[model samples]
Target chain A: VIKPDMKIKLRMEGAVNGHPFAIEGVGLGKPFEGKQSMDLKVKEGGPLPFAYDILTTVFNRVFAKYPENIVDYFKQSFPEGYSWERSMNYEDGGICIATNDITLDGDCFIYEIRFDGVNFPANGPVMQKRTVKWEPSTEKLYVRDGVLKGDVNMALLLEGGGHYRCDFKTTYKAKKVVQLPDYHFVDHRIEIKSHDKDYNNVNLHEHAEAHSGL
Target chain B: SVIKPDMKIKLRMEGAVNGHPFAIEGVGLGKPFEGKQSMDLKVKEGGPLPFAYDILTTVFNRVFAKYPENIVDYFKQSFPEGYSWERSMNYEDGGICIATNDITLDGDCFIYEIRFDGVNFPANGPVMQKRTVKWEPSTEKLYVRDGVLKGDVNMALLLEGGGHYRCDFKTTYKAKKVVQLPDYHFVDHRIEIKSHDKDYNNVNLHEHAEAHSGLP
Candidate 1:
């Protein structure tokens, strides 16, 4: 059981429909600990799922803060893929969010971000719309399955080039007996799909067209 | 990285060994910035290595007084094992020691210790002594591969009531990683024979039966 402490550098890159995209932001400061925010851009003319806005937001607010406290918090929050502990603040500027609660003998650290949010077209008339509902809420800037269950939300941000990136730091411990495996052996991947909000109404014509294409 | 330099902890442990007697001390100062739980200890004439008084005294002063700002480096020298850095310390103490450099990427942290000695008895020649300094993980997953002295004098805990003139020692460490991993990995070890002394003829030796017989 040769247990040596270790440090790992993790990075993730994400896009929508093979195009750059952005994601919402999570406030690490007081009052907004567990809440999410949006990253609106001033530029116009881009494809739907316009990743630039949120991607910039993520980069500026998340990715830019590498190997810092926010990154540390993310590692602590998710000790496994996607899984998380109850969100908490220790009053000492230290916060913990349990992402995964797996029962494996060795512990894990997870960092996650998402691009599963609605895309706002900067060139479309929607750009002029300022209604609270039309505003880019945290809901539209995420990609589904962006994070593993117990993963920490280390450095999560949108890059200036409209890409979503997340960084993680992880560790493992064991007694001297059997040799210990490296943390990189653990595997993971991400997937995304669109959901129709009006599906409950059962539009036969649209459904038929969609099915025909399939 | 959001600089939140508030979540940090400092811990230290020390001991001395002489002949068959030993003394140990440990201190877990939660956070050095807050200055709490700091401690100090002294062990005179510890009885584990009767002949190595000078070496033992040097270790005590260097370890206790000049505690390594970098905990991992401190363990690397004190334990002299093959434990790699899992996470780096991100404070004033960072980068103080290469082996124990606190390079935490995501808040994970860990350090371990193991030590041993070889005592040569007049009757038994030489006996191997060992000890495992740390075994548990503080936060989460901690893997270790400790090869102290290149398998020369391996360190191991003596079972209770083992012997009177026996090898004795202690081990301790500090870790800060998640605590949900399956198991913490470790290897408690040391070397057997370090080296042969050059001044063997000058040392005193007991008279053998051949000497009484007056053989040439």
Candidate 2:
């Protein structure tokens, strides 16, 4: 079990053919004061906190409107044009699991996120496309009773050759839910419509070939 | 004048400018239905009459709602704005009086209609900014028995460069009393607000300068 005040650094790299372009950010949390909850801190750029921020923002805004229909909306917002799919849900131990297919422009990039109430681990395979834009990042720590932790990961294809991907994991002690008044179940799912073919079928390899040299 | 048993045509126009928006429209009542001692004006517009008729009716309703008594309320509602210094009276026509004025906006557009009571000039004066118009029956009863009255009024927005934007209005009125019916005269009149640019021009310049300086 991770103790309070523990600090973790997360790194994320976008990949193309196994090569990588990476960024990083940090997360910190304290033990819950008096009650059983953790305090979390999210800082930019020790790892790629950008992606984490995006995901969190999406959760805060869209989830509040329709908490019950989150997964439905998520799937409709982001769908796979290739042979890939993603799923997310909360577990019994206050943990959340988000899994997705890591496909290049086609069927290549697959990734998964396992958040154990605090520290999250992101793991994904290399992408085969040339212009992949995935990047790993750290999320703000989930605090309860004073402890916090979270992580992010991404994969992207590079120009010329190779692909890149990153994995990160951090942990914090669990806290009492009552201590955190803001702790509420958020159900958000991104769904992609089939008509948005460009976003789903856009392959990095195709872009690299078209914008060669520059 | 006796309304012949023939169809007639009426015209109307409506628009909105600076502060006032009004509509104008008229209908030709086919003709007059003559009786031994009275006449019935055939309304051709059916249920929905012309805009001019509508304005007259609106004025009458406002007047009647307050006094219920016709003539006294007519004068009260018609001359609330305090008529011009020039007032004229017709001795032969049972105290037919006229007043004219070029009033100030006082920050509001003059929205009014000129409603006729058949034989007399417009009975209901232009509705102005001040809520001074009261119900006057003595004035209303005078025009109750006559030809149809027509109303033409407009709400105009004063433009910065000396112009007016016109607005439109329309309404309907049915005679409530038989003795008052023939004299009711189809409502008719013309209402207009002349465009004056002094105030609007200054405002336009102020806004334009602020925009140029990029000051919100």
Candidate 3:
């Protein structure tokens, strides 16, 4: 959650349609009086509130054409904050349980959230769960400073169906130095596919591994 | 890691037997995903004859973004012999599968390719000789014809014991920007997927069709 006068920078790079691209931008987000607001700077952005902010966006932008009911699926999955995991590689194996490891920064209320800091099904492919950590993270006393910075790495069958591996390095910084939204600051060289955004058409240039490292 | 690549898994809806919603969308992935384009899979067979088709488009032009594609090849490879997902990322029958030596072709499609000789197929019955999934954009129809992910993402699983029995196989896909899916974890906003095959079965799946949100 970003508040008034906080600086934020977001960098994104990856492929779409078998094309590779990268994008970087600076921006700010907050709720004024009571109305929640967001500004992508020249800047830019992705979905906010993960649920509604996006629900409406894709609804009009994409799904404007088609769309369901409440299965109350999540509740059934966690019956009791349950825990389960498996080794991915089989031979060498990769093991992960539902968890999140979050570290706070007093500097500007920055936080770096690892897989441990998030809650998702550590199980097979058909399962889906929200990061029990994120929505809950917003309510944290520590998050009061507004999200200054953070990074996330997620792996598995991805967005378009490959190993969806990528990392996000986001920061809300003030200009010239330590920042906040009140002052002026901005969002970057962004590469993307589907070619709908403001960036140029991308090719399968660098690996998502290289992009995630940024 | 808890997900078994080899199992013929489906997201079974609670209370309802084979009811499930399916979705495969582009995640925040730190990238500004555009209008949304397509998805496909690579395949193999282990019968007296073997073949492969790399581009089996299940979702295209953002129209079918909420659908899933595993080549619809589940039966072609599994019925005769057996099918299982190998760590290499290809489904295997008996002991053979696609050898994906190319990286570009590898990740682009078939990340968690699954086939079952795992859940239920023809241990001796319900021998699904042909498996097909079709999508028509202008008409907006997406579903599994018959077999497992049947008729408008309808769930049907053949229990192998005495007579091949069909049971409801619920499947659910959790939307993520917070981003991802599977069947066990329940998500507030999710997709209950089933099969849609127009040849034999049809549902107003398109009426129910909905595109997911993303950073565009």
Candidate 4:
């Protein structure tokens, strides 16, 4: 029942590799119309423009998949460990892919994002690859998951030795539902995969924090 | 990897157009996945939105009955030639609905929806814009299946093309997983994020900063 014309809001909070990393007001859908400017502020520092760049890039790509994958994401994450996946070749050349690995470890919640096939045209090249992994978090972390609640923790380790810790929480206000057989349906068709048709009905959260070390 | 002999993905459409015909496959809801009729997005390298003009013109020619590969020029030759048919033109085991508000070479947008009703073609269900086809609300119907998905899902795409922008019929399907997916949801709603980061003071990013309107 979600209408494309509806409005939505998203905010993020958490430490960037343990540093209090957060993003303020962010918008989505028609209301924003075009890309709205934003800045991610680190707990100990002023405007973290550099970290903003990486988060923005990730945001742009995943957010672009909003309309098509949002619903799927909803249906896929039904169980505590339920998960879903998708990928696409960028318009230019490179390909971008995503996975929503959700898990509920008792009372604690975990939400995370890892880079995959992320070589977008703008991503440039690896100025250089690093050998060290990101800081590890053994303790259970707090997060949110609901119609108007969720937290994400992300980090971009720079070759120069600094990394941007990115996190955010998103919430919805009102609700509006529209009938099917409309524009969004056509979009769903454009994405129906004819090539790979594998469906997993029961996959437990075995890949818990697969990349937590990085 | 809960368990799968060869766990993976479905789609529609038939034939080859300029070596590339229509194809679709992925996971979606309310497929009604009935009949042989289907559609998928065409976003190949050089193809406009993935289906090159040369290739589309061929399909265009099919729907128009040899409309001419030089149609772009011919349409320009007509000087602001604009035309559309409600009856539509059917070909390739499906019915194609073509809408042309502005067809001048100056470059606008044209739309076409091809629905394969399977048995009797459009006569049975060509899925016209208003009556034939049914569009679902943009809510929760489908999601990314980890690994690979299948099926030719239908969609209304507001696509960006070189020198051309369009809100047209797209049959985009999962040609491939291309890569693996993560475990996440579209929240209860959708929200976009943004930050300016392109090579830290890179001019190339700045060069595109202008023409690149609308980001979040």
Candidate 5:
């Protein structure tokens, strides 16, 4: 059972499409005893479909304000019992709408985080839209299957970019009995389809290192 | 890559050998993972040394690979990384054990400073102290006796937040059990490095320089 206010050490290694990616990081559970925060170091590689340089920089700022956000999401949305896929959603003003779907199967679980929003800036009046879905789950620290998908339409005049998209699926067989602290670790295998090309058979995987509780 | 996807890589080890408990836990940056290891053994005053001696020597070598004696070894073993627990110590006449400030190494030895406010104490007393430890057998080598790390050091009395020094002091402190674990015992051990860079194990590089640099 996932608890509140926990700390973990995380290492992720895999590929985006054909691009290899890796990360050395730390995760904090919700504010337990009034202290705990998440911090991750991108040691190597990055997520594809999403512009590595752009999306990563954006995410860095978002998480900086609330480092324990991811752990809080896991705790709040985690099902009381393994029933059906549980759903949780959030909406702000009238512009942003985000949704999540959580599924639990015996020892395995699936968690989905997605966002859909659009805006038309004033002055020049250019329209911008984005739709993103990230589904990552694990079982006993093994990344059974994972997916990262994104679609964006940006006005070149406003953001200096046009249109970009990607859909990636990850799967891995066989389990490694990596000894670890009382936390979760995962390694994911990947298959990707980005823009209009298919890189379905490239050797791609994300080996998420173990989470050692602080 | 030193890590092999085909084979399982175990990150920690615990439980007991010969009914004496021990624990070895660590975290790493993929290929290079550094962690602390410790063991608790029952010592006899006059009986023949138990088999635990062999394990003790191995642990010493593991921690002292880079230096003859590492000053931070005791603190790291006494408290696991990222975990919150109070270190118990008998200073002066009262007991003071609170979260210590981040420890920094100065050349061969290290320094640890701690402060406490008296909200619910005998006289609402605030106290602070700092110690610069030298890791020599005669000067300041810490030894684990009955699962407690015992050592003596010259402490400096710091007043008004450790900026200005007050006076020189001396005390013998033992960091044994924490408040969370009623019957928990602590231990100390060494480290080792094996295999090429591709399959390195138990190796700790820059043990002094990089210790606690990753923590916020």
Candidate 6:
């Protein structure tokens, strides 16, 4: 467990809409004041926190450019239309699990998150419980910010028709500490798309079982 | 080594035009901005290009303290009968997918040129498509048809796979800007970005069996 006053040196490197950035700093940990959540401190202005900020800004940019009604439609669930917040907890070792629930269109669909630190492979894990979700007739929009792969994964399920879906995924990666302009920072990428249920793919249901809860 | 061109920016512009309040807010790619004159305008470019363009246009206008052409005056006088227009451009990477503009040929309309990658309809792809919007004042118009593009063209696999980033641009211009009038406005803008040598590896996909079996 991270003490309330534990000082952790954090670093991240990433891009926003093709832009590259790196931010690092030493921040003290404190209990997060949220819901029945994890007892963790999402270090502010730190590598990960800063990356999230940049990602949200990019989301707004794209949202602003889209048609007003569509933008307003997603705003019902996403509120800000294109931003997200993450909760993290310090587990055993220096490792931790970071996760965020992105409920799409409403409670009908959701994306559960599970990410790990210090346990990522070069290629990362795919099938383990690193990420899971419950998509019933609804769909899942999961945010898997694991050690090697810090990504917000989203897809429009073709299972149910008539419902409109949009896919937006942002990826972040943290790096070792450095100095000056070379200091440690997070790497990021943002991708966006919109789909109307004009045509549905039957095979999409195949992955539904693969991603169901453990 | 610079792998890609990237940018970060924040800008806000708000003021009254002829006693009507107008504002523009943006950060990173920025926010939706709206404005107007004898005609109304709404412009949103969900990327850095227009965000940076506005700053440059403002700076240059201030430096010269003048506009080269009175497009607004020309628009009103040229088309005494009001006109209407709508245009949209969808982009992936540096390539344009499908772009369309409702233009009036009789007016002093500028011909806009765009290149399509033709991935959806290759036979008609890779060619330049042109159209013009009426310079004169117009009526009700819709810039981008919202979700219509998804069915208009089949985006490339790279775009669908999320490997390639995409940006949408929708804009509506009612009247042009007059150079003679002193337009008092407040704009706050800041930008920070650079090129870097970084590797963007592909997202690894594991087999369904591998995912369930908990195998690395």
- In order, the Cα lDDT scores of the candidates are 0.21, 0.22, 0.19, 0.23, 0.24, 0.21
**Candidate 4 local lDDT, A115-205, one digit each (tens):** 2444333343221222122221111111112222222222333454443232222322112231111112111100111111111111111
What is the lDDT for B146 in model 3? 19
Q: What lDDT is reached at residue B35 by model 6?
A: 19
Q: What is the TM-score of chain A alone in each candidate?
A: 0.20, 0.21, 0.21, 0.27, 0.26, 0.20
TM-score of 3: 0.20
Each candidate's clash count:
123, 115, 74, 82, 20, 17
Per-prediction DockQ = 0.01, 0.00, 0.01, 0.02, 0.01, 0.01
TM-scores of the models, in the order given: 0.18, 0.14, 0.20, 0.24, 0.20, 0.20
TM-score of chain A of 6: 0.20
> What CAPRI grade goes to candidate 1?
incorrect
Docking class of 2: incorrect
lDDT of 2 by residue, A36-99 (tens): 1111222222222212211221111111222232222211222231111112221111122322
For model 2, the stretches where C-alpha displacement exceeds 4 angstroms are A1-13, A16-63, A66-142, A145-183, A195-214, B1-216
Which is better, 1 or 3, measured by lDDT?
Answer: 1
> What's the lDDT for candidate 1?
0.21
Deviation in Å, model 3, residue B140 alpha carbon: 16
- Could you tell me how far off, in angstroms, the CA of residue A34 lies in candidate 6 after the best superposition? 17
Off by over 4 Å in 5: A1-183, A187-214, B1-34, B37-107, B114-216
Better of 5 and 6 by lDDT: 5
Task: Residues A37-139, candidate 5: write the lDDT tens digits.
Answer: 3344454442233222222211100011123312222233333311111111111112323333334343333323333323312221112123222212111
lDDT of 3 at B170: 21
**CA deviation > 4 Å runs, candidate 1:** A1-96, A100-180, A183-214, B1-44, B48-216
Assign candidate 4 its CAPRI class. incorrect
Q: What C-alpha lDDT, on a 0 to 100 scale, does residue A173 get in candidate 1?
A: 19
Q: Which stretches of candidate 3 lie over 4 Å from their true place?
A: A7-107, A110-214, B1-214
Cα lDDT for residue B173, candidate 6: 31
